[PDB]
Design a binder for this molecule. Structure first.
Ligand SMILES: O=C(CCc1ccccc1)Nc1ccc(O)cc1
Lengths: 172, 172
């Protein structure tokens, strides 16, 4: 995946978030620290926060990441698109996990109710574990795919099944 | 915290895999043709067992005492979904699901290669995404989980232009 998309993946609370532009940061709702009153040197009062279940978007009053260009964020992707989940793991290892996207679903994962775009990992037959699949620490990692020359981002990692074979992408 | 990924090591024109502290396996054509020592050990003290495009090195001291011994078998049953553990010079880890078929002699881009046939499950073309293999990937290992155990069953030897068909070189 291009160096420019890996530069947008930022360690955040108990998981990750993604810079769409200089002023727009998206994450997974449950990774946000519940007491936090300041983000990147800016108070709560100076930040626009749109929340839809497990998807949260922050828009700031000034350019946090002026090194960045605005890119396309969409409400999920067509059924059968293959995406990469841009996962950072221990020691500057970068894990772009291949996933085949399916339909909008509502599910129960280990007691919690989750809603988003379901997908199946293309890494192996049994994704359970950290070598071939996801860990709770990967929440907020972005779902991206290439189309006609450009790259699109279409959600953030919300959950994975007991077996690890199914993941859920929270969408706008 | 143990990891399979720690066993994948840069070697000659590609990669190799540590099966145990004393046992390293790779693709025969990536091995350097001019050499006196490999991992600090003089070739003097290295057993080399070649079977076509599969080579095994057994060292006379523990090069990786941090590792336990793993199960190595001569290929896997037909229809087993394996994972090819590709490391890139970018710092990327790319585990791709492959459906293994029959032992075969294959025309792959001009040349004849003997090993276990497989088909990538990412989709007929990777068009710019991390969904297929490149020449530099040769020597990467084929693994799958079976009960409580990882099995390694050979090394990445070749792939077709379209990238659909792959050959896993096996012990024999
Ligand atoms: O669905 C899969 C592979 C699914 C699979 C994964 C693990 C074990 C068994 C099966 N590929 C696909 C990609 C692109 C397409 O267009 C169609 C299919």
């Amino acid at each position: 995946a291009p160096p420019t998309l890996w530069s947008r993946v930022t360690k955040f609370g108990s998981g990750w978030g993604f810079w769409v532009s200089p002023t727009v940061f998206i994450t997974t709702t449950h990774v946000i620290p519940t007491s936090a009153k300041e983000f990147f040197g800016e108070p709560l009062t100076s930040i626009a926060i749109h929340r839809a279940g497990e998807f949260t978007l922050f828009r700031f009053s000034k350019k946090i990441r002026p090194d960045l260009t605005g890119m396309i964020l969409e409400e999920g992707c067509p059924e059968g698109t293959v995406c990469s989940v841009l996962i950072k793991r221990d020691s500057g290892e970068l894990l772009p996990l291949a996933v085949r996207m399916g339909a909008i679903a509502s599910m129960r994962i280990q007691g919690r109710l989750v809603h988003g775009q379901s997908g199946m990992l293309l890494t192996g037959a049994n994704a359970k574990g950290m070598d071939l699949g996801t860990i709770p620490g990967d929440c907020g990692a972005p779902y991206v795919y290439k189309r006609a020359n450009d790259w699109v981002v279409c959600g953030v990692h919300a959950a994975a099944t007991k077996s690890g074979n199914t993941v859920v992408c929270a969408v706008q």
